[PDB]
Amino acid sequence: LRKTPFNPTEWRALDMIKVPTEDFIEEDVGKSDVETYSIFTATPAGMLKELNGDVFSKPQFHPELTDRYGYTKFEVENIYLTYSKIMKDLSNYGRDNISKGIDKYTSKLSSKYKNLKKAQAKKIIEKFVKEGKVTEKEYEKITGNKVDDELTSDNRPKLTKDKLKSILKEKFKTQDDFNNSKKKKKAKTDALKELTTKYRFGNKTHATTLLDEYIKYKGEPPNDEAFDK
């Protein structure tokens, strides 16, 4: 019980045997087109089926071969194998349309803008349909944002290295913050809240890494790379 010898290295592993014409009594050998296939595939065990699960099959063919014999298949089973924009969007679909499928229409808004999580966009829609409108008090209550700021969508500042160095000097002004973890969590969240949103570029895990090094070195690390990073 061995794998088939049609593989190149396995073919060479078979022992060779010689025989000259001097031992030939009769011969009947020739080509034949009895076997001819174009597409070859190895389906997995026949329980798995295309309409109720994962990838069913993955065939292979040559473009020149199929011209003579088109779509000739060969199958084998193998057992083994933005307050304005948000409000405009709600006004575009309308309360009649939004009221039918608030959970999934919520996913449309959260898909378009990754600033809102599923809970945040779920609550604003419920307040929209029931009251019939959403004001700046409702928006800010859902999440703290600067609603009275229209700069950012056209232009948002660069945050070159010295600006970050300055914003850290605002968020950490006294040494007790390092010692008292409770306020440190509040401080760093406020840093990340402005630092991810207000400027050109935002990332949580990267900014976190910098904050963890900054905290460990007490706000003066041994290299300026901490502010490059």
Binding site: L51, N52, G53, S99, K100, G101, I102, D103, V129
Partner: protein, 195 residues
């Protein structure tokens, strides 16, 4: 489900819901292609996982504890308001908006069908969630208006039936129990206003 004709001649039966893009098993007559019939409708693994609230991975059905969760005739109408039954005494039915009907007997389950203060919220019921912890939103959020109209034609006394009574409930919360005799032009109503 069932279909037939009565001795009087009138035909009766059912029309089970039909859905596009569902997977259906087919059995050909006399194993002839060009002779199809649908045997049943089977859903996808994801769909089945979404429309069940059983958290148990597995276990014999004969276990008392497993009977609490396994034994659940859980069904959802085309409308996203659902109907629920269980081997325990809990049974829950839902209608348009957050309105529902519920019953239970165990003191442990008493919150599920209580009316203390404002009553139990729709979100407190664990059957109101999809399997992948999403709430089962109702399709229609507007409040319904119910009524139980009662009337007939005649009875064994032989006199024509003309007593009409209703238990109408309005969308604004009003309740009106009324008894009526239309031929005699008489009525007695017990009305409750939304205020």
């Amino acid at each position: 489900s069932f279909i037939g004709r009565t001795p009087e001649g009138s035909v009766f039966g059912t029309k089970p819901l039909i859905t596009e893009g569902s997977v259906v098993l087919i059995g050909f007559l006399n194993d002839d292609i060009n002779s199809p019939i649908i045997l049943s409708v089977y859903g996808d693994n994801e769909q089945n996982k979404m429309i069940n609230t059983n958290p148990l991975d597995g276990g014999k059905f004969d276990t008392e504890s497993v009977y609490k969760y396994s034994s659940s005739l859980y069904e959802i109408l085309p409308s996203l308001n659902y109907k629920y039954d269980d081997g325990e005494g809990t049974s829950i039915r839902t209608y348009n908006g957050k309105s529902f009907f519920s019953m239970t007997s165990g003191e442990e389950e008493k919150p599920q069908a209580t009316d203390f203060y404002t009553g139990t919220e729709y979100q407190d019921l664990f059957t109101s969630y999809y399997g992948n912890k999403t709430l089962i939103e109702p399709r229609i959020q507007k409040a319904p208006n119910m009524l139980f109209k009662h009337q007939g034609v005649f009875y064994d006394d032989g006199t024509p039936d003309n007593h009409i009574t209703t238990l109408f409930i309005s969308e604004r919360g009003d309740i009106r129990a009324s008894v009526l005799n239309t031929e005699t032009q008489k009525r007695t109503t017990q009305e409750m206003s939304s205020d």
